[PDB]
Design a protein around this ligand. Structure first.
Ligand SMILES: [Cl-]
Ligand SMILES: [Cl-]
Ligand SMILES: [Mg+2]
Ligand SMILES: [Mg+2]
Ligand SMILES: [Mg+2]
Ligand SMILES: [Mg+2]
Ligand SMILES: [Mg+2]
Ligand SMILES: [Mg+2]
Ligand SMILES: [Mg+2]
Ligand SMILES: [Mg+2]
Ligand SMILES: [Mg+2]
Ligand SMILES: [Mg+2]
Ligand SMILES: [Mg+2]
Ligand SMILES: [Mg+2]
Ligand code: NA
Ligand code: NA
Ligand code: NA
Ligand code: NA
Ligand code: NA
Ligand code: NA
Ligand code: NA
Ligand code: NA
Ligand code: NA
Ligand code: NA
Ligand code: NA
Ligand code: NA
Ligand SMILES: [Sr+2]
Ligand SMILES: [Sr+2]
Ligand SMILES: [Sr+2]
Ligand SMILES: [Sr+2]
Ligand SMILES: [Sr+2]
Ligand SMILES: [Sr+2]
Ligand SMILES: [Sr+2]
Ligand SMILES: [Sr+2]
Ligand SMILES: [Sr+2]
Ligand SMILES: [Sr+2]
Ligand SMILES: [Sr+2]
Ligand SMILES: [Sr+2]
Ligand SMILES: [Sr+2]
Ligand SMILES: [Sr+2]
Ligand SMILES: [Sr+2]
Ligand SMILES: [Sr+2]
Ligand SMILES: [Sr+2]
Ligand SMILES: [Sr+2]
Ligand SMILES: [Sr+2]
Ligand SMILES: [Sr+2]
Ligand SMILES: [Sr+2]
Ligand SMILES: [Sr+2]
Ligand SMILES: [Sr+2]
Ligand SMILES: [Sr+2]
Ligand SMILES: [Sr+2]
Ligand SMILES: [Sr+2]
Ligand SMILES: [Sr+2]
Ligand SMILES: [Sr+2]
Ligand SMILES: [Sr+2]
Lengths: 81, 82, 143, 46, 56
RNA sequence: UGUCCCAACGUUGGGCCCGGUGAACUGUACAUUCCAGUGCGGAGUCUGGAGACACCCAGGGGGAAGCGAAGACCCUAUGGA
RNA sequence: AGGGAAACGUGAUUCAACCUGGGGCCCAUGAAAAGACGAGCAUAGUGUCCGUACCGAGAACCGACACAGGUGUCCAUGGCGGCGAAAGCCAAGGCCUGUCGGGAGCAACCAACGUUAGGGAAUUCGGCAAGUUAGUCCCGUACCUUCGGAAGAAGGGAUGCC
RNA sequence: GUCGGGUGAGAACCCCGACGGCCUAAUGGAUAAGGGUUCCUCAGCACUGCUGAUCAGCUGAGGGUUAGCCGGUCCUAAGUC
RNA sequence: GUGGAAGUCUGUUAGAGUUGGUGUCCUACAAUACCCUCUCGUGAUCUAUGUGUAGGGGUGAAAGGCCCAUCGAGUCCGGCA
RNA sequence: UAUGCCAGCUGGUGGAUUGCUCGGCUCAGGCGCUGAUGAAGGACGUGCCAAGCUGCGAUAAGCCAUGGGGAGCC
């Protein structure tokens, strides 16, 4: 059984999305859908996911951009891992 | 420092579409010679460049009055229009 | 120092062609440190980076010519290049003439000057190309 | 062109294989990536 | 127009592609038949005795 | 009407000299040749004479029956199509 | 709302796009299907999956090459010009990379090309090559003809500017 | 192209300014196929680049492609299985 | 006068093609290229993509033309030393 | 004595030769079927750093049991 979340995608562009747009970026299993990415993220960090955009990368993986609700704080979440 | 009149008739030896270029060379050689300095030490102020290229790359003025100064420890020249 | 990247950002921030952006010669060092677009806007305000003006062709010489020609000059045989029918489309000219003649006849009729039957006789003659112009038609109407 | 998801995975793999033999493998084996490919000089499959 | 160099410029059609079955770039995407392993043509694998010397 | 009589002058890019880059063709050997002869009768190399101090630059190509291609002609093969 | 340093216009002509009609042609007749309309409105929820960079060519494609070749589409309404989507010149935009330079009034010779007195095809298999003519308007136009044509026949005159 | 200047151990050809030019159905803008990371950044010049190179489509290391409404996906065409 | 037909004319519009120079090139920029001249350009027109026809078989307004630089019988491997 | 000829000397270039063998070649004996309980093959993954090979399969150079083995191993 493959997992949905592989690991946080941490790059300059990721941090900006984290500080300025309350978004977290993840490397995820390319078989995962936007919905499966949302669910998994909520269950792993106990947050509320608002929107998920995906992209199949030229690294053979799938990258997900997960925006959290205004109730949660990306900066603080990512900072505990 | 002195005012000199440089003849550029020898640029006619080079193909017409490139006279401006040869002019700028003759000017450097003339000053280097008449001020007893190396060509490498002669600095042409852009004013002179613009004067020679005024009518494009093929139409050079037949002469040009230039004001040049000579000095420094290594020996160099600074020239410009007048 | 190599500022070609800065030129690209400047062209975008100033919304102009790269060939029109101007970088102050005495500030290559500062422009060279400009990494972000924000760094570029900053230098723009400082005036270290500006946009050269674009030109537009003057139409003065054209306007004088237009006047001479609207006045009927500068169109002698030696100035024509196209065939006569190319200088003025003949069917197009006929449309102009025939419509003008029919409008004239139509006004004379509603006005009472012409009876529907005199109007018909003239209208059909116009359609047969009987009159060179409106004046020519009027001159005919006057018997 | 338009690449499918699979085509894309293969292209990615090829890109990854196009890296160098890690420096430590040099020391360890005490002294080349024979499969080094260039986008221009070479031609990939498909 | 020469059959050589000038006619080579018109070649931008994709025909043979990586085959799902054998991995060779021999699956003709227009015929949907692999020229190397026979995929799309036969369940059995493409094979011939002439692929080797007669007595070997 | 420079095709010609009959060729001239000029223009641009090469050519020539300098920095840098830097191949290929071809090579049995020897080789400064020329006039005659001889020879499988079409010789830089054999014979007799003549000429010939070495090396280098530029040139137009007389010769090397020049280089390139196991003659596309012709014939022959108990050959092919 | 946005955008602009600022002003943050008003009318007109000619009018690509797009809309809608009329006419003509065929021994030629110019797809199909899914779908949509027909068949109202509020609020809410859902809208997953794949592609998305960049080149697109005198260096990113094919041609062994960073090859003067080959390679589809749309920008066909930028200004002068003129019949014009022609030439030539110029904007917007792009470029100095159809990427080795330096030097000799820079010879011979070669590639492209300009000008040649008098003669004027004598040259050559042959006017090959080069040249002559040229746009537009007016006059005028033969043999022959399948009556369409030949015809821009030919020949003659005019041409700017104010 | 030229004159100044910038960077650098090093500059004809990497960058700035000026002056001088080239392209107008293209030498400009958007793209199809095809290529496949060639895109962007930093650091480099042994390799590649018709000379040089501090530059680059080159080398090293990172980064970059986000869609209910743009394509695909749906329909059927010649025709194929 | 109107009308606007045409395998109609002119036309480097786009686009297609190629008469002559027996020009340039001919270890090329190029295993068919370059320049000028020249021909077609509303149609038996040109063009993109998709699709079909396969080797004694196709396809051919017929040149033995064309079927991936290969054709009076493709290419590959095998028969085969 | 320049350009240069012949032979050698020192140093290159080159990789012959001699020596060496983790690979071949051939013979002999033994053995001999796999797959819908999804094979053989391929693709893509999988390592702290990992491009190639080998292994392995999201439990990814490996997990468990029994026996062997042994103070080393990755
Ligand atoms: Cl109507
Ligand atoms: Cl798309
Ligand atoms: Mg997406
Ligand atoms: Mg850099
Ligand atoms: Mg008419
Ligand atoms: Mg990379
Ligand atoms: Mg023979
Ligand atoms: Mg014969
Ligand atoms: Mg026979
Ligand atoms: Mg080039
Ligand atoms: Mg004369
Ligand atoms: Mg004669
Ligand atoms: Mg002629
Ligand atoms: Mg077709
Ligand atoms: Na990863
Ligand atoms: Na390639
Ligand atoms: Na002449
Ligand atoms: Na000779
Ligand atoms: Na035969
Ligand atoms: Na116009
Ligand atoms: Na260069
Ligand atoms: Na009539
Ligand atoms: Na021709
Ligand atoms: Na055959
Ligand atoms: Na066995
Ligand atoms: Na590895
Ligand atoms: Sr990557
Ligand atoms: Sr290529
Ligand atoms: Sr033909
Ligand atoms: Sr061609
Ligand atoms: Sr094609
Ligand atoms: Sr089949
Ligand atoms: Sr078989
Ligand atoms: Sr002798
Ligand atoms: Sr010679
Ligand atoms: Sr109208
Ligand atoms: Sr894009
Ligand atoms: Sr483009
Ligand atoms: Sr091209
Ligand atoms: Sr401009
Ligand atoms: Sr260069
Ligand atoms: Sr004269
Ligand atoms: Sr004659
Ligand atoms: Sr004669
Ligand atoms: Sr006349
Ligand atoms: Sr160096
Ligand atoms: Sr780049
Ligand atoms: Sr016609
Ligand atoms: Sr025509
Ligand atoms: Sr000929
Ligand atoms: Sr000629
Ligand atoms: Sr030839
Ligand atoms: Sr027409
Ligand atoms: Sr062929
Ligand atoms: Sr054989």
């Amino acid at each position: 059984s493959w997992d949905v979340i592989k690991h946080p995608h941490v790059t300059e562009k990721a941090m900006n999305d984290m500080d300025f747009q309350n978004k977290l970026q993840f490397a995820v299993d390319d078989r995962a859908s936007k919905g499966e990415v949302a669910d998994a993220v909520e269950e792993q960090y106990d947050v509320t996911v608002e929107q998920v955009n995906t992209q199949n990368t030229m690294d053979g993986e799938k990258k997900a951009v997960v925006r959290l609700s205004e109730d949660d704080d990306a900066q603080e979440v990512a900072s505990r891992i | 420092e002195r005012v000199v009149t440089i003849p550029l008739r020898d640029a006619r030896a080079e193909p017409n579409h490139k006279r401006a270029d040869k002019a700028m060379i003759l000017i450097r050689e003339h000053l280097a010679k008449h001020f007893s300095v190396d060509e490498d030490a002669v600095r042409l102020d852009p004013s002179i460049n613009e004067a020679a290229w005024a009518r494009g790359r093929a139409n050079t003025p037949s002469k040009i009055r230039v004001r040049a100064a000579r000095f420094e420890e290594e020996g160099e020249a600074i020239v410009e229009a007048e | 120092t190599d500022l070609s990247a800065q030129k690209r950002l400047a062209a975008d921030v100033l919304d102009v062609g790269k060939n029109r952006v101007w970088f102050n010669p005495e500030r290559q060092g500062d422009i060279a440190d400009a990494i972000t677009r924000e760094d570029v806007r900053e230098l723009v305000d400082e005036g270290a980076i500006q946009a050269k003006d674009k030109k537009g062709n003057s139409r003065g010489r054209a306007r004088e010519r237009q006047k001479k020609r609207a006045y009927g000059h500068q169109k002698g045989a030696g100035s024509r290049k196209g065939k006569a029918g190319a200088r003025q489309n003949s069917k197009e000219d006929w449309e102009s003439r025939i419509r003008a003649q029919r409008t004239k006849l139509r006004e004379l009729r509603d006005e009472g000057t012409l009876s529907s039957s005199q109007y018909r006789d003239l209208y059909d003659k116009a359609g047969g190309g009987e009159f060179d112009s409106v004046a020519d038609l009027e001159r005919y109407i006057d018997a | 062109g338009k690449k499918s998801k699979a085509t894309k995975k293969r292209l990615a793999k090829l890109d990854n294989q196009n890296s160098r033999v890690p420096a430590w493998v040099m020391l360890k084996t005490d002294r080349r990536n024979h499969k080094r490919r260039h986008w221009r000089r070479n031609d990939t499959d498909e | 127009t020469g059959a050589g160099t000038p006619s080579q410029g018109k070649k931008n059609t994709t025909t043979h592609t990586k085959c799902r079955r054998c991995g060779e770039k021999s699956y003709h995407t227009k015929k949907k038949v692999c020229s190397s392993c026979g995929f799309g043509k036969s369940a059995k694998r493409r094979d011939y005795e002439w692929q080797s010397k007669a007595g070997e």
